[PDB]
Amino acid sequence: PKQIAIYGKGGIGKSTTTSNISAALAEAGYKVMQFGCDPKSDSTNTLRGGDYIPSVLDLLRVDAHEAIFQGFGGIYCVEAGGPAPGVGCAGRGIITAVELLKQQNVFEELDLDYVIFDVLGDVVCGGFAVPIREGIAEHVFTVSSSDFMAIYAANNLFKGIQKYSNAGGALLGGVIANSINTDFHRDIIDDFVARTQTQVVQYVPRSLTVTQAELQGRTTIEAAPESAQAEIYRTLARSIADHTDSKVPTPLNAQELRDWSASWANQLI
Amino acid sequence: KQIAIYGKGGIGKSTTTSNISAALAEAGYKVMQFGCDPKSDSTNTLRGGDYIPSVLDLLRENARVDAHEAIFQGFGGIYCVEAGGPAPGVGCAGRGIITAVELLKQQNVFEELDLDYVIFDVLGDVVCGGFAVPIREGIAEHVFTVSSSDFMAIYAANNLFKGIQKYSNAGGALLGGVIANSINTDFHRDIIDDFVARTQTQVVQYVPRSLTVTQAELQGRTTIEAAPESAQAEIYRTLARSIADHTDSKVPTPLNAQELRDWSASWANQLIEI
Amino acid sequence: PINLKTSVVESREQRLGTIIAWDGKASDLSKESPFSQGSVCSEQMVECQAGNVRGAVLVQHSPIGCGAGQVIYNSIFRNGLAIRGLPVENLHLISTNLRERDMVYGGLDKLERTIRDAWERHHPQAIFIATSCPTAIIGDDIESVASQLEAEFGIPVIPLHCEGFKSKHWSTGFDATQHGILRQIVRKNPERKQEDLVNVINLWGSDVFGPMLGELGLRVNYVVDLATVEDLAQMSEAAATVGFCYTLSTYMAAALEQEFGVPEVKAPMPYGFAGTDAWLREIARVTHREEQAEAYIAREHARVKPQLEALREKLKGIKGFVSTGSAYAHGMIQVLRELGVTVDGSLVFHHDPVYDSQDPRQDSLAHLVDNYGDVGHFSVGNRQQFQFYGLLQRVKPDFIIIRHNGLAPLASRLGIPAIPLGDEHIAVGYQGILNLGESILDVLAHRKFHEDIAAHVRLPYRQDWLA
Amino acid sequence: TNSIEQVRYICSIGAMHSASAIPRVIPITHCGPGCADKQFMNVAFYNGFQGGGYGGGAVVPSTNATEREVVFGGAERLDELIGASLQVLDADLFVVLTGCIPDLVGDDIGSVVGPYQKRGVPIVYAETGGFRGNNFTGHELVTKAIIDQFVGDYDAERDGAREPHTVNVWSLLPYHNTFWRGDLTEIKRLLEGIGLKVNILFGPQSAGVAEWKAIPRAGFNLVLSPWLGLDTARHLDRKYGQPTLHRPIIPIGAKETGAFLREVAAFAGLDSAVVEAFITAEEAVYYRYLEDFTDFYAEYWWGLPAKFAVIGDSAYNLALTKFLVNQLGLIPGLQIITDNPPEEVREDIRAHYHAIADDVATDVSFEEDSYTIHQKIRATDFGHKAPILFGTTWERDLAKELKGAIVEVGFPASYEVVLSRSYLGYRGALTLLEKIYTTTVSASA
Amino acid sequence: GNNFTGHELVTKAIIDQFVGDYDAERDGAREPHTVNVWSLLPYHNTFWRGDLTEIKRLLEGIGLKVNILFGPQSAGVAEWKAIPRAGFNLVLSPWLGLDTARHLDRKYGQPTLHRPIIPIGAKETGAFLREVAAFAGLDSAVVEAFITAEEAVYYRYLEDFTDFYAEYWWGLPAKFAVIGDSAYNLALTKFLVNQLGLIPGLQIITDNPPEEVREDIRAHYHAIADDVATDVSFEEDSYTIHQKIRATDFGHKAPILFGTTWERDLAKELKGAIVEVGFPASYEVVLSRSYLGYRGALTLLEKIYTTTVSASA
Ligand SMILES: Nc1ncnc2c1ncn2[C@@H]1O[C@H](COP(=O)(O)OP(=O)(O)O)[C@@H](O)[C@H]1O
Ligand SMILES: Nc1ncnc2c1ncn2[C@@H]1O[C@H](COP(=O)(O)OP(=O)(O)O)[C@@H](O)[C@H]1O
Ligand code: CLF
């Protein structure tokens, strides 16, 4: 199973893009499992129709197959879950969930073509970086947009990933662009990717078809398969399917990104 | 008065918190903004973007910590202090925030700066009890969650309400309302107003999505700083006025999964014909 | 000053400057103020301090693993009761027994249930709560439960923050218990001043201060260890607070003087003729008993000195070595000189450059160096026995002095006998010197066991490094 | 309820003594400053006054996680510690044991230990956090880690053929069962008597890591415990294909030992003449020490206690309950197993107590809280005579209050000094009889 | 006399009448590698069964054929009929069996190896086994291999005991007193002095030894180690020995009494510990425990320090 992880800034479109990619891949006949590493239990919201499903941690011997719920296109939606915000340790919860899944051999007793780890926005402990260890994921993409803090989060995540890339873990496959509509957005998100020596997998624009499908609890593939955004997501899923070029991150320093941002502030003036 | 700002990830907590902090500072208040983010970007727009060492970056390179050495004076005189933490995927940032808050409480710097407002800008993934420290019965009483018209933002707001409700029934902080961010169309205002009305809460203000913010961000400046007379800075000044005099905090009354789902489904039929 | 406004005690390293690594000459450790083998944590010291308060129950908010220390401290508690003429019984420490789910979702409900169970089963006058490494990583917020249950039951409920990783030395575990007791149990603004009672901050050793200060017409209030919640409560009414070891007596005594107005004695620790004399001059100057002291100083000088002439003769040119503790180690290094024993090296597990009392005239190291000469191979190390072997071969002593575990067996495998001093009052005062001479004589006779072990044992270290 | 007064076991990181119990093995701990000292000082030093040994006690390296190793991680500290330990200490095998901090923080331990293994360094890592369980779970984890990362793959044409008469012995937990050294010595002596080559794997009798490298060549695995060691045995069955024999009852006395040896022989297929000749000699030595005891215990004027209450881990709890019932004919009173077995094995454990004799049927309650244990002892009227309590140092006060005697037989045995004492088999049964009846007679002394 | 005189009369009677005379061409040639052991008084030394078991085990281990003659390890009248076939008579006792040894030497001509000190520990046991091997000219390879194995086992349990011995919190007794027969008295003094390094405070031998051997026993106690010189007194009246115990000064530390039930009250008077080693041992059940040899020294340490630490028990 080609195992992928998705990182980036919080609330930027990791779950939206991940669900659209999984839907477009399952539209092509493949078997895809989307694992949610956010304790909010919302990564596969658009694949289950918005209905609440139990998580792995709600079973903590355990049988991890009872936490596997499949939705649109037969996508295997697995949610790690966790506590309500502000108590406990969700990082240890993701560690426990992934350990239980591995001990149950879910990724191999299922015949999945793809596994996409959708992680939360704030990687704060080594329990949220479990997907990017050795033998877990090989392609890791960080979603980002034209927003300067999105680029900041992506660069900080490159710094975080570099430790695992240098230690036999996953390599930075590239960058996924989202909410890219104007030409300035494309230019400022291409300059960053050229400065860090990686490659933008594809560009995704901000369209209200995703808003409508979200409110409806669906994804653009299911909601409007004949719309432009659905075709864009199909192209992105195809690009992820055949992607191979992953490199060790080369993140910019604080001063480097500070000057890069100052060099792009004047482009809007 | 001690305030905490929560919300969904990447939703504007740091930006709106910095804007309201700068508005309060311009009015003449002694405001300290405590960043509870390992990335150390919460107060990035108060310092021009340049890196400032945090408290957790004074612990790893020293044995006795003087919290003052980690307090940096930002735009307008704001005591911009970052908790800091490790790089993504290593360490424990929640314990880092616990240690930081404990350190500045023991140093009593909350009381030796003659402050007026202490605002805790928190991260968006409140994953442990380390990040609930600023709502923990003696550290802050006014908690606001930043939310937008996006359904996942509202989902995160409801989840945070469920989380805060535990501390509210413990002598901790009470939910003070909802911050509305990135609201341009009338649908954006209407949907968030209905969500707030369904949760027995209030909207302190509505701030639209603008390019003033974007540009002032690139420069490392605040909207109150870069554009002291624009139509987006004025909304931040009025939201700072509305958060200064806020007193009607309540125990959060969130919706369960089914209620929020049904509500979103009902509002999906209104977007089709709007 | 001590910050009592907070429910969390600062660490000893942060408050004083604790040094848990050093090697050199004691004069230098006095002027200055990759491989590890395991240490003690603060949670264990909290178990041994707040768990030995009689009439109170200590709650361990931890996984069941952190509650292992109940065995050693239960044995010490029982032996202390037997020594001090009290009925013997087991101490009751209760653990919340946290599991993996409590690490994921928090374990505050289990903590509250355990506190309620403590109250139901034992109905104590106070309840302490002990924090651990995992419940501090996840931030369980024990203070809310503590406040609620204290308001409910009525008895104080004291949260002690004693994580292992918070401090690099375990002496902070004394700070935690003393902090909690000061903030909750010790009554403030009392209406009764017991002018004949003095607070002796001690451990579970034979009662020697009772008879010693009884000659001065004083009553002894042993506190913390085998003490009653009422004895802890009437600690603002005593006329003075004293102790034997500086390390265990700084925080509580200094905080008592600052807050509750209990006079604190800035006198040398009572070890050796000079130290014990200067100690009694001031414990009897605070209580205005500077007339029964000189009549007790003279009596003991006229009773122990004739017996110490023959005792120094039986130990001529014998080499000694103290490897334990911080301040109940400089006392040995000074008493041994009183017996003429050679001491050219020592190992203390930490060194506090300053004390909570912050008084310059309370340096144990300065007293040990200025009086009774210097130690030329002084070394600080947080109870690591890969370094003890090097020190032992550097000085090569006939016998060592230990109180804490972990260092004596290595010396035994090297053929070097050790004096165990768990009863900390054995070497206190003039009879202390007379007892330590007999102890050295007995131990030197015991040298045949360690020499037999040294000839038929293999050290785990490797000869590449053994060199 | 969750609470536990007067703990009956220790942390899962306390299985460092399982590794230290292997000769020439030094565990390495990645944990807080005082986890290693606490676990040693409570399971060994104040549990029979057993020593650290070769690679235990204060010899164990430890990371001693400070506040820096928590906020920023401590994988580099563990790497540095292993690098320095490879040059400071002389060990056949190093075992890395993580505490509750590396497990909560999520330190990538494999990324540190793996490089050492790729160089051929004999090192192993196990994940034993405080929240995972007690020292029994940690023992199973350590055994599996050592097996997988040190024994490795098996090739009969390279690593040696399989000897049907070599047995791996998975038995009581080292250093937690107070008499484990003598007990393992007795077990190995009996197994070698019936004609087996024994991989005892722990204690002085073991051959070190050479005995562990021979695990795949062993004919089968013996699990001499009601529940501990069954995970290891199942892992070995899956990995190498070794059959397993589960002997839940540890045989204290000639009656149980004869049956135990007969069943082991019927397993392997050993010669029925060597087994019945070793057993004949052992019975001959054992019985003659009984007639004289009989005289005492069949003609004692002042009467002997008739009811007992065993409170201890399942291994000793059930060996003592079987012995005190089928040999001494004592009345089985309150039995409480306090090692916290997994819920799946509890039913069979209890079913062993059901058939504890053809005439006697009893039962056990799994209770880790000593307050409830004390209250059930108080809530079980022990006839007119005084009852004898077979427990730990926590039962001293209760036995003094119930006018009865106490024999310490497990963790914590704070009032026994143990060097080579055994309570299993023939010699161990005799020693146990002496201890029990010296304690009972010593009531007017 | 006493039970000791009765023992040395009974054994002499069996040797003189039941064993009879010996013909090396009729009863079998004398075996130079067969030994007769005359060490302990049965049923009076409380732990005689385990002691003889250990002695037979050691002698068999170095390569001898042992006639232990008492206890379960013996074969009864078969070993007593093999007395004339033994290479030499071993008297592992200070004076008990010397008369029997002389009677055997006169009747038969067997050389007598007198071993006044019964071995407890590894040093004493190694010396004992080497002296027996030198006397009987055994193969030193088997002797050295057995000594190496036994000491490898012994010094491991001692590597484990060393932690408690050097590290116990409340300290351990420094001086001791032994009251009992001369055999155990001397064996225990030698052990407690050479292995443990305890200080001898008062040794009283209560079995009424004849005056012809008391000087020899006093000499054996005058050198109980290369550097400590002690002594011993002979008093058979319990009141006199109790008064002498009360008149003895030990120090600030409470001593440990290796006496018997008659010293229980006296032991509690001194606040010390009482290890009943002699007669009568009325407060302990004994089946197979041994207090001598390689394995018995460990049991002795267990009992001593279980009694020592069990004051707050
Ligand atoms: N391309 C897009 N067009 C329109 N809306 C989008 C687009 N991408 C994301 N969104 C919306 O923005 C919000 C981001 O939520 P989410 O995808 O869950 O972020 P993350 O999982 O990274 O925290 C959701 O309401 C989502 O539907
Ligand atoms: N009202 C707004 N107008 C313009 N840009 C905005 C607005 N709200 C948020 N953003 C941008 O979206 C991104 C989110 O960054 P940030 O405010 O730091 O998020 P958070 O504090 O929730 O992690 C930033 O580029 C921010 O400037
Ligand atoms: S369940 Fe955890 S791994 Fe187990 S024994 Fe406990 S910490 Fe350790 Fe504790 S004893 Fe002190 S407070 Fe931490 S350092 Fe350690």
Ligand code: SF4
């Ligand atoms: S930062 Fe991660 S490891 Fe630390 S408490 Fe929070 S969730 Fe747990």
Ligand SMILES: [Mg+2]
């Ligand atoms: Mg998401």
Ligand SMILES: [Mg+2]
């Ligand atoms: Mg932010």
